[PDB]
């Protein structure tokens, strides 16, 4: 009572009701009060993620004390918190010893409470502990406890671990609707259970950084305040919260709705916006992804295991680069592993990395280490027909059971990824001998487990226009830093085709071909003159090359 400047009270202000009723989490209080009444290894410590309700539990304990529900062994005691940030090189221990003296002079069982004790731990308080005068209650997280309370601890023999995992959705919903009338008078508009459950599920779904009991309340109170500030609609609602979540993340409030039909029905041209032609292919792949996400197939299998073959450079990779954007929300999600190194017997274990203590161990495997983190990729396999006939064992093990075991000992799961097996077979075969070749080259019962084996059709010599038009409308962005406009002339743009297609490399060069030509040919004018940001820069076909 003499040095009460680096610590607060919990039972005094509980005579005022300055604390929230603590509905939920009625088991942890029994656990704590049971550990607090032993003879040794008493004075527990709460262990859990930040923002889950550890302080909430200790406050509820204080409130049950002031009410009177505990055994008389614990009856008639106060609780005091400790702020570690109020002290901090040195003199931290001076104030700490001044505090411990007061605690000992308390001459009773006046229980303390220390939040984030792993800032203290040490050998200064253990004699205070192993004598029977203080009782501390703590708080930290699991990995912290494993660091500051496990390596140099030697005090783990007097701290009891109590776990506070995290609430469920249907439980934090009750928590919220219990903590509702408060804000209904603080701001005061109106509250709908629809808004509450919407906040809960949307935070759970898209806010993957924080945790539930406060993560939800954050959005609820911020949205209520935004609605109050609006009055410079007299109700709150689910859209009234999706707008907040969108202003929080960046993704628009439209897509923040149904994610099954509103996705399967988008498998239309929204793919064909980035991919071109091959409409049979896109429709087939869309069937594959739709009927697989229905919810009747075996739950332990990839979400798609189709392959496609034919000519090069027509967009074989581009279909996957676009598909990763629509489903997993990124084009930096695919992983491509060439089956050209894997032409020997031994190198098949390079994509796992076998033993602890050999050359490639901490480097992990090529196929697994890129999956156990971010398990939502889109795996490609260039020129699979060249891989040694031993990789197929690992591959069949994948697509027959959604699991695999790396070198470390971890278990990885492939039950929500998409396999893709490209190939350059089909040199002359149109549709007749190409399938005979791919039925005789690969194992016959392997292809029994695949999905559709669709064959890309060549670029229609007219349907080079759409791809080059996408390329050109893209490069229309290039010189927007100067706002210079571009000229198009269908003879010139078609003159790129017959001299840049090169159907041995698909359509690969048509990016450098045009960017180097236009950019570094204008690089004289763009420095001297001849152009400004209203000039379409008329470029045309000289009888030989592409002058202006």
Ligand X SMILES: Nc1ncnc2c1ncn2[C@@H]1O[C@H](COP(=O)(O)OP(=O)(O)O)[C@@H](O)[C@H]1O
Q: Which residues are annotated as a binding site for ATP?
A: 48-55, 310-317
Give the β-pairing of 305-307 and 418-421: parallel
Residue span 55-94 as binding mask against ligand AGS, x where in contact by CB under 6 A, dash where not: xx--------------------------------------
Pair 347, 493: CB distance under 8 Å: no
Interface pick for ligand AGS out of 9, 102, 239, 318 (rule CB under 6 A): 318
Q: Quick check: 301 binds ligand X (CB under 6 A)?
A: no
CA–CA gap between residue 12 and residue 491 (Å, rounded): 87
Confirm or reject binding of residue 119 to ligand AGS (CB under 6 A). Answer: no
455 binds ligand X (CB under 6 A): no
Size, binding site for ligand AGS by CB under 6 A: 34
Helix (H) or strand (E) holding 292: helix 279-292
In whole angstroms, the minimum distance from the beta carbon of 20 to ligand X comes to: 3
Closest C-alpha to 137, from 270, 42, 72, 211: 42
Binding window for ligand AGS (CB under 6 A); candidates: 46-54, 100-108, 366-374, 496-504: 46-54
Residues 206-235 contacting ligand X, CB under 6 A: 214
Distances (CA, A) of 426 to 17, 242, 346, 401, 511: 79, 50, 29, 31, 26
User: Applying CB under 6 A, which of residues 47, 54, 200, 425 lies at the interface with ligand AGS?
Assistant: 54
Q: Closest approach of Cβ 467 to ligand AGS, in Å? A: 6
- Cα 79 to Cα 73: distance, rounded to the nearest angstrom: 15
When asked if residue 489 is in the footprint of a copy of itself (CB under 8 A), the reply is no
In whole angstroms, give the CA distance from residue 144 to residue 155: 15
The answer to whether 340 contacts a copy of itself (rule: CB under 8 A) is yes
State how far the Cα of 123 lies from the Cα of 433, in Å rounded to an integer: 80
CA distance 72 to 63: 15
Say whether residue 187 binds a copy of itself (CB under 8 A). Answer: yes
Binds 123, which of ligand X, ligand AGS, a copy of itself, none (CB < 5 to 8 A, cut-off by type)?
a copy of itself
- Interior/surface letters 229-245, b for 16+ CB within 10 angstroms, e for the rest: eeeeeeebbbebbbbbb
User: Phi and psi dihedrals of 264, rounded to 5?
Assistant: -60, -35
One residue of 102, 144, 218, 318 binding a copy of itself per CB under 8 A: 218
Q: State the binding partner of 424 from a copy of itself, ligand X, ligand AGS, none, CB within 5 to 8 A by kind.
A: ligand AGS
- Cβ–Cβ under 8 Å, residues 162 and 48: no
**Residue 519 DSSP code:** H
CB of 355 to ligand X, least distance (A): 29
525 binds, among ligand AGS, ligand X, a copy of itself, none (CB under 5 to 8 A by kind): none
Q: How far is the CB of 433 from ligand AGS (least distance, A)?
A: 17
Judged by beta carbon distances under 5 to 8 A according to partner kind, the member of ligand X, a copy of itself, ligand AGS, none in contact with residue 524 is: a copy of itself
Q: Is 478 in the site for ligand AGS (CB under 6 A)?
A: no
Closest CA to 455 of 440, 471, 469, 436: 436
Tell me which residues in 478-507 interact with ligand X (CB under 6 A): 506-507
Strand ranges in 169-259 using DSSP code E only, listed in sequence order:
none
Minimum gap (Å) between residue 534 Cβ and ligand X: 30
User: What secondary structure letter does DSSP report for 460?
Assistant: P
Query: Which residues, 6+ apart, have CB-to-CB distance to 435 below 8 Å?
Result: 429, 453
- Find where tokens 């209650």 sit: 137
> Least distance from C-beta 423 to a copy of itself, angstroms?
19
H or E element in which residue 93 lies: helix 92-105
Give which of 181, 176, 328, 171 is closest to 241, Cα–Cα. Answer: 176
Tell me which residues touch ligand X (CB under 6 A).
20-24, 50-56, 175, 178, 214, 275-277, 312-318, 467, 470, 506-508, 511
Binding site for ligand AGS (CB under 6 A): 20, 22-25, 50-56, 153, 175, 213-214, 217, 274-277, 312-318, 424, 467, 506-508, 511
């Amino acid at each position: 009572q003499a040095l009460q400047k680096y610590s607060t009270d919990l039972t005094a202000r509980a005579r005022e009701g300055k604390l929230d009723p603590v509905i939920g989490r009625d088991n942890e209080i029994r656990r704590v009060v049971q550990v607090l009444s032993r003879r040794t290894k008493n004075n527990p410590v709460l262990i859990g993620e930040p923002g889950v309700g550890k302080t909430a539990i200790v406050e509820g304990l204080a409130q049950r004390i002031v009410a009177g529900d505990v055994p008389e062994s614990l009856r008639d005691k106060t609780i005091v918190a400790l702020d570690l940030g109020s002290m901090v090189r040195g003199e931290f221990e001076e104030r700490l010893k001044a505090v411990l003296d007061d605690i000992k002079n308390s001459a009773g069982q006046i229980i303390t409470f220390i939040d984030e004790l792993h800032t203290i731990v040490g050998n200064m308080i253990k004699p205070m502990l192993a004598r029977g005068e203080l009782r501390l209650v703590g708080a930290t997280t699991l990995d912290e406890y494993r660091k500051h309370i496990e390596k140099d601890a030697a005090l783990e023999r007097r701290f009891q671990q109590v776990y506070v995992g995290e609430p469920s959705v249907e439980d934090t919903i009750g928590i919220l609707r219990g903590l509702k009338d408060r804000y209904e008078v603080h701001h005061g508009v109106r509250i709908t259970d629809s808004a509450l459950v919407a906040a809960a599920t949307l935070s759970d779904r898209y806010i993957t950084a924080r945790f539930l009991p406060d993560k939800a309340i954050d959005l609820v109170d911020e949205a209520a305040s935004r609605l109050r500030m609006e009055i410079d609609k007299e109700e709150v609602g689910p859209d009234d919260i999706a707008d907040v979540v969108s202003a929080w993340t960046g993704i628009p409030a439209g897509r923040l709705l149904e994610g099954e039909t509103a996705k399967l029905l988008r498998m239309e041209d929204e793919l064909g916006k980035r991919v071109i032609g091959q409409k049979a292919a896109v429709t087939a792949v869309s069937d594959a992804v739709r009927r697989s996400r229905a919810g009747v197939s075996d739950p332990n299998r990839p979400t798609g295991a189709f392959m496609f073959l034919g000519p090069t450079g027509v967009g074989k990779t581009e279909l996957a680069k676009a598909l990763a954007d629509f489903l997993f929300d990124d084009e930096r999600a695919m992983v491509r592993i060439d089956m050209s190194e894997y032409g020997e017997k031994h190198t098949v274990a390079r994509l796992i990395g076998a033993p602890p203590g050999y050359v490639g161990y901490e480097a992990g495997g090529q196929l697994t280490e890129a999956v156990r983190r971010r398990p939502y990729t889109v795996v490609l396999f260039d020129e699979i027909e060249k891989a040694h006939p031993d990789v197929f064992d690992v591959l069949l093990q994948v697509l027959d059971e959604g699991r695999l075991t790396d070198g470390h000992g971890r278990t990885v799961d492939f039950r929500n990824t998409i396999l893709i097996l490209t190939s350059n077979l089909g040199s002359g075969g149109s549709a007749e001998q190409v399938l005979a070749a791919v039925r005789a080259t690969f194992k016959p019962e392997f292809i029994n487990r695949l999905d559709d084996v669709l064959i890309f059709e060549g670029l229609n010599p007219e349907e080079l226009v759409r791809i080059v038009d996408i390329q050109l409308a893209q490069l229309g962005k290039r010189l927007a830093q100067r706002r210079l406009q571009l000229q198009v002339s269908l003879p010139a743009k078609r003159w790129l085709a017959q001299r840049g297609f090169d159907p041995v490399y698909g359509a690969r060069p048509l990016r450098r071909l045009v960017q180097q030509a236009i950019g570094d040919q204008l690089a004289k004018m763009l420095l001297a003159g001849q152009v400004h940001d209203g000039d379409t820069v008329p470029v045309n076909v000289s009888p030989d090359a592409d002058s202006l």
